[model samples]
Target: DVQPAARGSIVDRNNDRLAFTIEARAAERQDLRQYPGGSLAANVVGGIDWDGHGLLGLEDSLDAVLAGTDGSVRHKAVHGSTVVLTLDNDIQFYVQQQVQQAKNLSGAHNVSAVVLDAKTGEVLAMANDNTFDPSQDIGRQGDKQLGNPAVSSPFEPGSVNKIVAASAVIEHGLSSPDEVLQVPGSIQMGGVTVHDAWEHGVMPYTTTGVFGKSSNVGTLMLSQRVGPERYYDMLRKFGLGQRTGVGLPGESAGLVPPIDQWSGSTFANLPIGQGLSMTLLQMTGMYQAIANDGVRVPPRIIKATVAPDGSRTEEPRPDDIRVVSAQTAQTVRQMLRAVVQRDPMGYQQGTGPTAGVPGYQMAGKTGTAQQINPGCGCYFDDVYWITFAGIATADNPRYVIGIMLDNPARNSDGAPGHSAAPLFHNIAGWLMQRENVPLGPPLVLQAT
Candidate 1:
């Protein structure tokens, strides 16, 4: 009897073995999938079915293409190609630990984050608190546990989504960062009145001031300058309401209401990052756009493929989408920096002070999106999707991280509304060391 061709191993960016096929028991005599890291990127890597065909995740999607180790001639079997991922096992492991720490502390129903290489769009880490051991009995894990929610699940992004509207205004030359607006404490839109998270009278605030403070009233004012059609087109360009094409199974196209369906309040909701939904990874792409200088290269998961004959084919990079001019993106990045500013900078403290990582200049937004209780179609009492997305080492943008918690179980006081930024702080600090990136501010960059 001919030995069947072996299914190839799946490796991380550093060539650390993640998923590989092994010989089965004597009674079975067929090859079986083995996950050495156990639950490490389980949702993304996946496992094989009992019959030797790939089951879920990369395993399922790459099955025939990478192969079932089939196409046998009489007794001869064919070889399967090796699948390589863009993930860094070391970074993946660290991010997963950070994910679990946040989940445990906040009691979030789910915690997920994605760290993307800003310029290249390669995913260094995609982590989740919910995971299963792919090496274990596959049937024991529920679909809820097996799925990659960061890629598939859509949640309201809240204030972190202001990046879109801000970009639109700046790109259209409708507003400059320092352009001042007399912002009211509250304004009526559609059928309801919208108020800033913090109460104040009509105050003079620059366009950057409006966003850094995460003021809904000012955002809608800025968006109104662009109107509905152009703003909607801007969202489409930013990759919202679209699949990121990260090459993972079950990836979602986040929900965005059509322009025709807009009611008066829908206008209020869209610009301020409400009345819309996006996956954390999708939000990361939005931030990545700014980090990559207004150019969003769709993130990639598959790095390359190695055939049985030792030939390798590198996966082509995703297309670059220029959502805004470089000037606008640079301005937006400066504004995002304001969102996390404090003491030393001598400006007004923004909402995400905890997001600061010592020794690195950070730029990010803190989002507190209300989670709607579907039973009544109204907002939950206090439950929310708290998220923070930002760029690290802003001087020479390195990586952009997207951190989020889904309906976390409240602490003794209540739902953890202020936990996301700290997680970002912790992760970013470690990433700096791992990359051996030199500290900033010494090298002189030429002004364009």
Candidate 2:
């Protein structure tokens, strides 16, 4: 192997001799805050400069930890502290491989995933497309597409917003999982018409059905009856309108207009996750709330602290802040499980194999909402944004994940089967199996 001709020598963490250096020279520390980790942890550990100042993601959010103090009796005895990030290189490499495989096979514009320690706030892996290796120069990829899409880009969340609305309804004691919404094919309000994915005349659908079917009309009708202030408050409580506080630079503040801003069908649209924007982090946090026993922990990356003597002290588990009642969260999880639970002989099942894991009692909600046609001041029906978010077990919680695809032209009519849910099934199943997570307690299945 070619060796560094200058002053660099590669050594393992255990001080194992990996390579020998011929020329050795010690130089003054240069500012590397701008260079940061380059694209290595672009989405999570965002880059810093030669001086090792943090620029984004975990680097920025956990800066105090990453850039620790240098301890020394004298300048000659000075040993700079190195912050040990929570990321597992092996796990990160695997996640990157999966994301790349998905992008190649789906021809997707991008793919990203953040694997967090469920018990702790430590981020294990945050990998994405169009990334640059830290050892190489960043010139191969442009900076515009270099960051993690999970924290930086905010898209119209489409149907995934149903969970937020559902939480609102549950919070206000205005709806239950079995509560029925008389869904008209279309409802005209405030000079806008709200419609369903498929035209049906006054179908009897439950709140669970609204989630299962991902019906725009069904959810809007529910929200209209529930009113705006209470609903919008829940969105705010979920941390929608603000930065994720993940500390990534250039992070978009997802749109969350005030309740008073609900003019011209805006209230109705917000319930179904339209007329709004959400970063993937915010979206996933909602699901994480469910996984975290109705508590919304501020998503974190740094896992623990290390001493100069090489001892490690673990970081505390993420503080669980209650977003909804435990009972309400459980109720929602059960209903969400039903959303992905398909009939034995139905279109949702399709001709192909079922996408669900055999044993885990998972909960999920899928969304497919149309994009806005700015030229016409209306949304295009065929252009869809798809999403699925859920915790693995309805009975006992393990973890929650959210997946979204923007402007997918391929999701035909079968939304759950044809689009978002499949991606969720694939990723969730892989994680559960790989982690050997056992089945959660059985959900109390309610009869309609």
Candidate 3:
């Protein structure tokens, strides 16, 4: 019997070990794969199959690259190549801790989180709850728990998707960021009702204020200015209705129905984050595009491949595409900044003031999407998907972070900004401290 070759090790950008092989005697000496961090990076590193082959995660995606060939009868067998990932072990550990905290505190059915280098789109951390250890029987954990939610599972992006309409309005010169709109409590759109999260009757709001409040009515009004074709085009330009191709197996290309097939209410629904679906990674990519000055960089997990001969081949830098003009992105960034900062009287006015870090300027959006009832094809009355997508160092972004809590149980009126914003706050603050990112300026302490 041919003995199993030693699989290459997987390490973080700092060369911190993540996954490697352990010596075990299976009648014949064999190298069984082991994850030192256990299920911490399980979804990314993946698990092996029965034949000791790469089965899931990067293990399956780069199987051929990490697999060893059979040795000639006259010569000795060689070791397989190593894989270097973009993950930071410390970041991964910290993110996982925060994710679990979110899940436990919110009583959410599931939680998914991602952290990426804003400029490079390199995955620094990817985590989800209800993960399994690769060393054990993954099948017993059920299929849902086996795959990574960050890349595989799709959800309604909610108000975070509002960025599409806002970008379109700004890019086409349809509206100014400060343009005032008289928003209503509710509106009728093709027999469907659209309303803001709260009942506000004919209030004067600027474009930035509309986004800061996550007003469904306001976004719908803005979308009409963009028009149907223009709005759909902007969605595509932002890389919606597609997989991010983040080098992960079983990645999902989120559902974005063709404009031709749209129903009467489709346009109304799409702008405020309904009638479409996207994976966590895909949603994160949208913010990433905005953070990197409108240039969308494809995310890369595998950094290099090292052969047994000690030679290393680094993965080519992926091409970046311009999604929108830098001015448009900057405009959106400024609006997003308004989403977190307080009013002149120091009243907590926006949806995500908790997301703000003291020494650094940040920008982000909060989402409170309704869950679809499969049986009735209607929005659930009680359940909600809370989410937040943000970037640190507003003037000069370095990291883009996205967090989602699925159906968090009746936690404080079920607002994503209230639940998910704190998570972004904690993680973003830690990343800035750990990476030695300089603070923008000091803020004067004020009482609420």
Candidate 4:
């Protein structure tokens, strides 16, 4: 049995409980809180130690805020200030339910989601499969499973980074969505050959096609066109190798080395979302930039400041830094929108309004990234990261969702289309119904 008043809990902007911290004196001295949202925020909310110290996730990131400040009181005229979050509890619950179910059904090691507000860089909800309930302290094991992967974990982003390259190419007028390239199955980089998951054998693919299919070779060719220096610059512009300003510990800087480190073949690989590493948050924010008309704002999950009297103050207007032009974003949005319609890797389920939603314009890119061998000093095909990051309502963007399933087996009955993509669809469908977000103009993206 647990006492109600002793537990510490974090509340969102709407005063909904984000997480809790509890302390147990005996029986292994437990600490637990309710994640009514299920594993919805497991990673971000993280868990606490038996003594109630913030352990990981948002618990660690926003510790100071959640810890509350000490002040003098005359037995009255005082109440602790509340921390207002940017996360909408309703949407968060929805995201958690859908993503967690998918992860379980697919037998995935873990799954994560980051819902963002494009204009203000507000992270609406952060969720992961390996998440723990802070209140209950269940399955409290490794530090690895305890934090928000959206902000903390760094991995080869796969083709999701193609949005940046596609923008660079389009912004410089270097390429068009329709521009065709003869895609070879594999290409050499620094004496290393990069192979595609499928061998279409000199398949004809457009700039959009390369992205649609998550073709590593096609993206390498495109990135090679930008060279190393400018490409890295683009990566930096897209918020790679930078702090996301969530104020969290263990948040990775993301590995995007300088051009000088490009040992010949590295340059080609970087552009196509390989060699260069990024956190899920970075990739999501970059997509948010596209959704925000090419203006990338610093991402934030806390929406407002709170005073001692329970007075809430709105967060300051965020600086909308231009990552690219609206035109570039629009052009790329169409290409990403096309991604939902076509079954690039035979992963699309040809039912339920294209990519499983009705009467809304959404654009996204799928990436199947290779995992490096831990013992072999190299990468192998057995490991893959299936991902999608994009904005819905491309005509008038409202919300952006980013998703990832690490090391998903290819033959695992639940493929990306079956596993990750439907999670996206479920989230999108709920947003449309719950938020009552109006649908945008239909600009059908036809594959060339």
lDDT of 4 by residue, 1-448 (tens): 3322233356776878766544554555555555565555666666665445566766665666555543343223223345567788878777777766667767667788888886777888877775655556455554436567777788898777788778888888888887878888999876678888677678667776677667778877887777666777778888888887765567788888877767867766776677878888888888999998899987887677666555677777667788889998888887776666644444331112234366767778767678898898798757777677878777878888888887664312365442366667777778878877764332232233
Error of 4 at 141 (Å): 5.9
The 10 consecutive residues of candidate 1 with the worst lDDT sum are: 439-448
Query: RMSDs, each prediction?
Result: 4.0, 6.1, 3.5, 5.1
> In model 1, which runs have C-alpha deviations exceeding 4 angstroms?
1-3, 68-76, 142-144, 344-347, 409-417, 440-448
Query: Arrange candidates by lDDT, highest first: which order?
Result: 1, 3, 4, 2
lDDT of 3 by residue, 1-448 (tens): 3544567777888778777777878757767777788887888988888777878888887877677766664656677788889898888999987887788777888898999899999999999977788878767767546778899889998998988888889989999876878888898986689877787678777787788878888889888888999888878877888877778898889999999999988988999997999888888889999999899997878888888898888889978888889998888887888777765654326777778887778889989888988899888987788888999867888999999889786342244333688889889999889878886222221211
Query: Which residue segments of model 2 deviate by more than 4 Å?
Result: 1-42, 46-78, 86-91, 116-122, 311-319, 347-355, 372-382, 409-418, 439-448
Give candidate 4's whole-model lDDT. Answer: 0.70
lDDT of each: 0.83, 0.61, 0.82, 0.70
CA error at residue 231 for candidate 2, angstroms: 0.3
Evaluation by TM-score, superior candidate among 1 and 4: 1
In angstroms, give how far residue 250 of model 3 lies from its true place: 0.8
Candidate 2, residues 258-342, lDDT tens digits: the string is: 8776676787678877788887777877777766667787676544455445666655654566788888888877777766665
